[PDB]
Design a protein around this ligand. Structure first.
Ligand SMILES: C[N+](C)(C)CCO
Lengths: 62, 117, 417
């Protein structure tokens, strides 16, 4: 899915899969690094930057 | 977690095991019903550095006793906006490897959540 | 066949450049002292030891490196100093995490070892490569390199590294400084291996052509001299006051003008660059006037005055007075350094220059440690005014003793009969 940023985040974007009623799961870190524990169902997927003193998730996508 | 009356002061306490809390960063992310995930605060519990979201501003304060492996998020002024499941996440320090690796960790050890209404 | 090459100016310009690079590392941390204290979460004493390790290593390792400069020759020492410079600069890269202050300290101890090999070379490079009408120009270039390294190590770190708090955005800015100076050090190390030659094909000087065709014993005849011991102690007090003021400059300037880390580095640059004019003017006036005790006395007392001016105006909340007073204090503190070395050469003529210089250095380094530790304790407890009056009372004592050094010129007594 397309996640764009109002500033430069520089590949510090991660993707998280949240299925209803559970803590989220990290899928891709560094914008291009598949996380070993949860490698690739249906759920809400949130992108998230880590470039900046404040960390910012995405709007949310079901 | 638990129930609080508007304008109260709650102390959420996240506890880790298997990784020393001073090595990493500890974040708190709330998720209200139907509003998705929303980042609140972070702390590097060795440098004591803390960051907060402009949303809370003054009320919340994140801390950590890096001698029992626990971090704490204490509230001070609450709303109906501050009601949601509060997750405890960890980012591991991103080492400065310019260009050659440049790995931006993402929380990989989320917390099982705790409900606060 | 007596002739000067052109490598004599390459050899020196390369030495001067890696000599510059080690001096930047001496102060790369002392210049942002409050930023590294925040990164590693250590005290100021701990970041002060990153400057004081250079002073502490120089003391035991001064004689062994002299013995290796005589037994292995000039090119091995060059390769050794430039390689230890490169290795320390490249070990510092593995300390980019708040928890890794032992690794920054290990890399800095390696660079401090490199220092001992770099500082013993300038006069012998001059001797080996240059004519007798160029040896002083060569040694001046070789010492100007080090001191321009100290001035750049005061001004560049704060510019490259901001006073931010995030432990991973700050390590990004520290890693850029570590990379530049590890790349520069590696370039100069590779340069040395290719450029440095042991000796020129012909002797440059008639004295060198002659020389081709024991230190401990000297050290024990130099402490039979009361005047040279007075000069050792007073030169040590002055140069150790300068080492203390340099190591501790960020601390006091930031205590008084918070947020001015860039200007704290600029005030350090002011000190060093004004002092280079001090050394130049003094050296000229001394060589043309031959008044050794009186010039030494006047520049010592003026060091005292400039610290009293610096002490008692640092609290006026005007950062421009701190520039005037530090650029004056540096002028006289660094102007006194050529005087001390010359008056020691004179007070002890049949002895070897390199032993008198080694002893003057050893005392400067011993007092630099003593002052830096002492003052920092005074400052942490009692404020910058009292930490500075501490350094005025030793400059006053050194001034009192510089008056008791008899003008026994044995070199002027010998060379014009
Ligand atoms: C000579 N330096 C000042 C660079 C080091 C002092 O120990």
């Amino acid at each position: 899915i397309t996640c764009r940023a109002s500033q430069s985040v520089s590949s510090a974007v991660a993707w998280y899969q949240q299925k209803p009623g559970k803590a989220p799961k990290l899928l891709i870190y560094s914008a291009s690094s598949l996380y070993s524990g949860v490698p690739s169902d249906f759920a809400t997927y949130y992108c998230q930057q880590s470039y900046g003193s404040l960390v910012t998730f995405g709007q949310g996508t079901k | 977690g638990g129930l609080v009356q508007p304008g109260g002061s709650l102390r959420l306490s996240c506890a880790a095991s298997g990784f020393n809390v001073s090595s990493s960063y500890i974040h708190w992310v709330r998720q209200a019903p139907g509003k998705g995930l929303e980042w609140v605060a972070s702390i590097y519990p060795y440098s004591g550095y803390t960051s907060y979201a402009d949303s809370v501003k003054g009320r919340f304060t994140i801390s950590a006793d890096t001698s029992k492996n626990t971090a704490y998020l204490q509230m001070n002024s609450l709303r109906a906006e501050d009601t949601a499941v509060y997750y405890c996440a960890r980012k591991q320090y991103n080492w400065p490897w310019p260009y050659i690796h440049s790995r931006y960790w993402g929380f990989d050890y989320w917390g099982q959540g705790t409900l606060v209404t | 066949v007596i002739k000067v090459s052109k490598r004599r100016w390459v050899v020196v310009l390369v030495f001067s450049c890696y000599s510059l690079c080690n001096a930047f590392q001496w102060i790369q941390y002392g210049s942002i002292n409050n930023i590294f204290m925040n990164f590693y979460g250590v005290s100021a004493f701990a970041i002060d030891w990153l400057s004081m390790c250079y002073m502490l290593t120089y003391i035991p390792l001064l004689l062994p490196v002299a013995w290796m400069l005589e037994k292995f020759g000039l090119r091995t020492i060059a390769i050794t100093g430039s390689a230890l410079n490169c290795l320390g600069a490249w070990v510092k890269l593995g300390s980019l995490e708040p928890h890794l202050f032992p690794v920054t300290m290990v890399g800095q101890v390696i660079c401090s070892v490199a220092q001992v090999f770099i500082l013993g070379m300038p006069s012998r490079i001059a001797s080996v490569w240059f004519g007798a009408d160029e040896v002083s120009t060569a040694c001046s270039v070789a010492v100007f390199g080090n001191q321009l390294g100290i001035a750049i190590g005061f001004l560049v770190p704060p510019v490259l590294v901001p006073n931010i708090k995030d432990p991973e955005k700050l390590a990004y800015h520290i890693s850029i400084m570590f990379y530049i100076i590890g790349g520069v050090a590696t370039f100069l190390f590779i340069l040395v291996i290719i450029v440095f030659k042991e000796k020129p094909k012909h002797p440059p000087s008639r004295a060198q052509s002659l020389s081709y065709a024991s230190y401990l014993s000297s050290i024990v005849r130099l402490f039979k001299n009361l005047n040279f011991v007075l000069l050792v102690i007073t030169y040590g007090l002055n140069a150790g006051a300068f080492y203390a003021l340099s190591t501790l400059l960020n601390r006091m300037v930031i205590l008084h003008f918070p947020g001015e880390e860039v200007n704290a580095g600029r005030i350090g640059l002011t000190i060093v660059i004004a002092g280079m004019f001090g050394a130049m003017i003094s050296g000229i006036w001394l060589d043309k006037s031959k008044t050794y005790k009186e010039t030494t006395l006047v520049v010592y007392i003026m060091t005292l005055v400039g610290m009293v001016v610096y002490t008692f105006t640092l609290n006026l909340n005007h950062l421009w007075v701190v520039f005037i007073t530090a650029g004056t204090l540096g002028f006289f503190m660094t102007g006194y350094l050529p005087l001390g070395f010359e008056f020691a050469v004179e007070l002890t003529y049949p002895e070897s220059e390199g032993v008198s210089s080694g002893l003057l250095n050893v005392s400067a380094q011993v007092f630099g440690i003593v002052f830096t530790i002492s003052q920092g304790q005074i400052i942490d407890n009692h404020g910058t005014m009292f930490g500075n009056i501490f350094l005025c009372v030793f400059l006053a004592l050194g001034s009192a003793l510089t008056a008791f050094i008899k003008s026994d010129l044995r070199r002027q007594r010998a060379n014009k009969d």
